[PDB]
Amino acid sequence: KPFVPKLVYFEPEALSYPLGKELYEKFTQMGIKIRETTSHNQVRGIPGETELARYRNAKSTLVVGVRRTLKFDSSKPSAEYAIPLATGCMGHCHYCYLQTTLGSKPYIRVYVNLDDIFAQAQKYINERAPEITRFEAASTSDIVGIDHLTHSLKKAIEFIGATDYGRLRFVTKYEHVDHLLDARHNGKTRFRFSINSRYVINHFEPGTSSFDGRLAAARKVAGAGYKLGFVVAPIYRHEGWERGYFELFQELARQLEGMDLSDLTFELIQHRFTKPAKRVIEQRYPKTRLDLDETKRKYKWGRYGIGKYVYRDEEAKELEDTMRRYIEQFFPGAYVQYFT
Ligand SMILES: C[Se@@+](CC[C@H](N)C(=O)O)C[C@H]1O[C@@H](n2cnc3c(N)ncnc32)[C@H](O)[C@@H]1O
Numbered sequence: 389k390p391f392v393p394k395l396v397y398f399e400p401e402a403l404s405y406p407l408g409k410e411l412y413e414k415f416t417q418m419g420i421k422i423r424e425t426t427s428h429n430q431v432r433g434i435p436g437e438t439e440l441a442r443y444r445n446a447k448s449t450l451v452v453g454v455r456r457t458l459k460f461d462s463s464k465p466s467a468e469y470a471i472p473l474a475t476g477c478m479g480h481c482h483y484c485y486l487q488t489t490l491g492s493k494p495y496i497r498v499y500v501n502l503d504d505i506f507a508q509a510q511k512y513i514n515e516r517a518p519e520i521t522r523f524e525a526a527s528t529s530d531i532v533g534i535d536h537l538t539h540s541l542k543k544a545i546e547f548i549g550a551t552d553y554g555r556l557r558f559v560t561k562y563e564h565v566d567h568l569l570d571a572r573h574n575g576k577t578r579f580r581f582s583i584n585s586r587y588v589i590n591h592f593e594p595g596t597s598s599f600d601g602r603l604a605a606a607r608k609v610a611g612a613g614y615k616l617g618f619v620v621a622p623i624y625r626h627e628g629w630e631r632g633y634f635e636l637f638q639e640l641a642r643q644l645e646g647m648d649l650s651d652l653t654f655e656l657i658q659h660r661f662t663k664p665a666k667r668v669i670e671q672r673y674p675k676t677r678l679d680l681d682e683t684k685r686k687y688k689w690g691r692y693g694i695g696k697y698v699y700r701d702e703e704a705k706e707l708e709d710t711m712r713r714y715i716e717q718f719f720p721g722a723y724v725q726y727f728t
């Protein structure tokens with residue numbers, strides 16, 4: 389509010405880059421505890437005697453490192469590629485799918501070699517030009533929520549804005565967007581916000597900005613000329629979900645009335661969870677009301693990893709049809725990019 393870490397790790401090589409140097413100067417000036425780590429993927433000594441303590445303390449830890457990977461992962465259906473600027477999040481969403489992603493770490497990571505990263509991005513753009521290449525910057529982090537510390541996203545926005553065939557997009561649950569409002573985005577960045585029913589936000593999204601805060605930020609970014617979008621996710625069949633999601637879209641329309649919404653986009657993602665999710669989530673959030681009963685679900689098998697549970701076809705279809713009705717009612721001429 390906005391996020392500031394209570395412990396910072398640096399890779400020694402990180403100090404060779406402007407961002408690493410800048411962050412070391414900032415955090416030493418603030419008197420924050422700073423440690424050294426050989427790799428940002430191998431961070432040792434995070435305080436805590438229990439698993440819950442170590443998890444919660446990791447969520448208050450920042451790790452400053454060099455990105456050595458290299459190839460960008462695909463990010464379909466959002467975008468062609470995930471541009472890697474950060475990994476991890478300070479938020480505590482009970483359902484967060486990043487918790488059980490292969491190789492995910494609970495701490496927040498930021499990468500300092502932006503020249504390298506943007507160079508590789510340009511390479512991907514050139515490989516496909518004159519076709520457009522889209523980059524997702526919040527695939528494995530809340531890149532916006534972290535950004536006031538680094539301005540790495542602001543730099544990426546302006547990098548992409550300068551390109552002819554590159555486009556950028558990202559989604560956030562945080563309202564701390566003021567430093568991004570004067571960025572030279574050149575119309576090539578889609579600024580999105582995660583929204584949900586009152587039930588889901590109140591019960592499952594602690595440590596994030598409120599709905600009203602997210603909408604205040606949305607009006608700001610739209611007013612600064614960014615393309616605006618919303619991601620309705622996770623779509624979760626809680627008791628009274630039909631009316632809950634009806635009221636979401638009704639309230640969303642009221643909070644955006646007056647504004648031009650001719651190019652507004654919606655993305656719909658149903659709640660999914662993996663086989664190890666129940667054990668992990670119940671350890672980290674003992675009092676959660678999140679239902680992870682796999683017997684009511686359909687399993688989608690993994691390809692190179694493990695798969696996940698989604699709602700059954702009938703219930704998934706019901707969710708999709710209902711969401712599409714609401715968007716048609718309150719946002720005629722808004723585009724629904726996908727339901728998954
Ligand atoms: C990985 Se989230 C990273 C970006 C940012 N920190 C944010 O929260 O918007 C990206 C989206 O995915 C959703 N999401 C998270 N977990 C799940 C899930 N388990 N099932 C279904 N959806 C899940 C979140 O609500 C987001 O809309």
Ligand code: SF4
Pocket residue numbers: 476477478479480481484485486528529530561596
């Ligand atoms: S804000 Fe996004 S990345 Fe952070 S815990 Fe919530 S879903 Fe996960």
